[PDB]
Amino acid sequence: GHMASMEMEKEFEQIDKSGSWAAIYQDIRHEASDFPCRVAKLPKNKNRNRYRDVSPFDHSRIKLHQEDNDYINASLIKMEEAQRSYILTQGPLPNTCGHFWEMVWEQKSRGVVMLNRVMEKGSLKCAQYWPQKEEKEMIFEDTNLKLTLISEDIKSYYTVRQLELENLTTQETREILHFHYTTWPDFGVPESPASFANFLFKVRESGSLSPEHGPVVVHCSAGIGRSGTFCLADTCLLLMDKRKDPSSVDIKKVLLEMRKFRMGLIQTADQLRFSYLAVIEGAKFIMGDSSVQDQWKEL
Ligand SMILES: O=C(O)C(=O)Nc1sc2c(c1C(=O)O)CCNC2
Ligand SMILES: [Cl-]
Numbered sequence: 001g002h003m004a005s006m007e008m009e010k011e012f013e014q015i016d017k018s019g020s021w022a023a024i025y026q027d028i029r030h031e032a033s034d035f036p037c038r039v040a041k042l043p044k045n046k047n048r049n050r051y052r053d054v055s056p057f058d059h060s061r062i063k064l065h066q067e068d069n070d071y072i073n074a075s076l077i078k079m080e081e082a083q084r085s086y087i088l089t090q091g092p093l094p095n096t097c098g099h100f101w102e103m104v105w106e107q108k109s110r111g112v113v114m115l116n117r118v119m120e121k122g123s124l125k126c127a128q129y130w131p132q133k134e135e136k137e138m139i140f141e142d143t144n145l146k147l148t149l150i151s152e153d154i155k156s157y158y159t160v161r162q163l164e165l166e167n168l169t170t171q172e173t174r175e176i177l178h179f180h181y182t183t184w185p186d187f188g189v190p191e192s193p194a195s196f197a198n199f200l201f202k203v204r205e206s207g208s209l210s211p212e213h214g215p216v217v218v219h220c221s222a223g224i225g226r227s228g229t230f231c232l233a234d235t236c237l238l239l240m241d242k243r244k245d246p247s248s249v250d251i252k253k254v255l256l257e258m259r260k261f262r263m264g265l266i267q268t269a270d271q272l273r274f275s276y277l278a279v280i281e282g283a284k285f286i287m288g289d290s291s292v293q294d295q296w297k298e299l
């Protein structure tokens, strides 16, 4: 609402003009929770982790419904006051794509949010874990899942795909929505915060964030940097609508709360700054502000 927006724009200006983004970000890194990741660091799970320095805390990790090995590099972020849950995970590996879709099935997710490209800066950041062609579906033999591209809607800043995920054991099928932000730059943050807020609204509008489904699955390459940006902005925007006076939302506090559930969320001070801008812009759109109706129309 109006007061939450005023306080946040005020705080943004305060930080920006003082050039305090780096100090604030370093404070966040210093204050951030430290919890054990013993399961992630077991020798048998080394090939299930994309990055040796990015692991899920034991207490919040997602468990596959597996007797042999229940490990996947994924964390449940449960935001109590905001009443939102998110699963943040690394980009699947050649050998963990079956695990990824097993997790989607078992957690009853409706949406997958992808914030990276399969190739970035000349290297592979994520396995091609979904089919690119309707007529070439994918079978994940280890978890007995079939995945078919049904349709896709290619926009300038993002792509939405309708996928059908089928449990081959039971022959039940589910519609999964793939929300792919395809224009995050190789260096720095997106030039358009409004395009990112708009992307979030498309995810929201599908129902993929709603309590009647399991938690949305969000990923970048490591599932902490861009992934943290997405969930932080969504939760801060929600809180800005639900608090009485004082209605203000403290982004640092929300981010520290989220970092209780997964390490390293938001990987740069630029990403922190960008999170502010996306929240500010999104709130203006929500409130029907006429000034942002313009450049939002070519979106
Ligand atoms: O994709 C993101 O936004 C993200 O968090 N990426 C991260 S975080 C992170 C790495 C990467 C990577 O992609 O190489 C490499 C090792 N250190 C931590
Ligand atoms: Cl082991």
Ligand SMILES: [Cl-]
Residues within 6 Å of the ligand: 116, 117, 118, 119
């Ligand atoms: Cl891609």
Ligand SMILES: [Cl-]
Residues within 6 Å of the ligand: 248, 249, 250, 251, 253, 254
């Ligand atoms: Cl707060």
Ligand SMILES: [Cl-]
Residues within 6 Å of the ligand: 029, 263, 264, 265, 266, 267
């Ligand atoms: Cl960090």
